[PDB]
Amino acid sequence: DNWRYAHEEYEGDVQDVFAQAFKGYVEDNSDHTVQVYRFGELGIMEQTQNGILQFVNQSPGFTGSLIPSAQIFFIPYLMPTDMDTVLEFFDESKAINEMFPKLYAEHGLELLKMYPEGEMVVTADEPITSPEDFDNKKIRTMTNPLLAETYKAFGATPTPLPWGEVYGGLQTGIIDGQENPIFWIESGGLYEVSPNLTFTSHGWFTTAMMANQDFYEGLSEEDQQLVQDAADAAYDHTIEHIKGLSEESLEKIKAASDEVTVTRLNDEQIQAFKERAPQVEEKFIEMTGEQGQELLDQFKADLK
Ligand SMILES: [Zn+2]
Ligand SMILES: [Zn+2]
Ligand SMILES: [Zn+2]
Ligand SMILES: [Zn+2]
Ligand SMILES: [Zn+2]
Ligand SMILES: [Zn+2]
Ligand SMILES: [Zn+2]
Prior knowledge:
The chain has helices at 14-28, 45-49, 83-92, 94-105, 145-154, 163-172, 182-188, 213-218, 221-256, 267-274, 277-303, and strands at residues 3-7, 34-37, 55-57, 109-124, 138-140, 157-158, 177-181, 196-199, 204-212, 261-264. By secondary structure, it is an alpha/beta fold.
C-alpha cells in the first residue's frame, strides 16, 4: 500500500532533497504515499533487493560489495570537468543511461536515476596548482581504495579519519587537506582551519536512486510512468538546488573568512593531473576485472 524509500543521509542533505521532491511528486499526483527513511532509521541495499523496501538511494561508490563496477565514479577525470558538460554527460551517456541499469538489473534493482551531488573540492594549508604540490600532504578522503589511489598517484599520503574528526585533524595537523563538495566544506566550516580551496575538476560525487525490480515491474503501466515522472521531477529540482547551494556556499565562505583562497586550474594544469589517472583505472580494473573493463570502455567512448 505505502511505498518504503530509504537513503544514506540525514534530513536536508542532497539525497534527502531528492527524496522529498520525489515523494512530493508522487503524493501530489496520486493517492500513494512515499515513506522516507533517512540514515540509521532502519537499524538497506539488501532490503530493497528482498522487496522489504521499494526504493533506495545509495551511491555507486559505496556499492562496491554488491556491484564492484559501481565504484567507477571514483576514477579521476572519468567525466567532463565543467558543471554544464557533466550534466550533458549524465543525460546522453550510453554508459550511465543504458549499461548501468543493466548492472543493477542483474541484482534485482530497477535503476531510476543517477545524478551528481556536486563537484569535489580540495582544501589544504597551501594552494594546489600541480601534482607536485600534493607531495608530503596527508589528505583525507572518503574511504575507498580508488580514492586513496587517486591521491597516492597525485603524490600525497592518503590518511583515513572519521568524518566527525576531520575538522579537528585539520586544525591539529593530523591531516593537511581533504576533499569534499563546497557545501560540506562551508557547512562543516572546514575552511576555518583549511583555508585554501582548489577546484581540480577531477571528481563529481555521483549518487543513484533505484527500486526493487519485481516491485517496479509489478506496477501498472501508469504507476511505472508515475515513478519515472517523479524521478525526472526530483532530478531537475535536485540539480538546481545543487548549483544554487554551491554558489551560496562559496559566497558565505568568503563572507566569513578573509584568509580563504580560491585556486582554479586552467586547461593545462588540469592536463598534468589527468596524466596520473591511469594508475587509478588500473586499480579499478584490478578490483572489477572484465565487467569493469566493459563499463570503463563505454565511459571512455562517452567522454569522447
Ligand atoms: Zn550527499
Ligand atoms: Zn488517501
Ligand atoms: Zn544534446
Ligand atoms: Zn554484468
Ligand atoms: Zn497507482
Ligand atoms: Zn535548494
Ligand atoms: Zn595492476
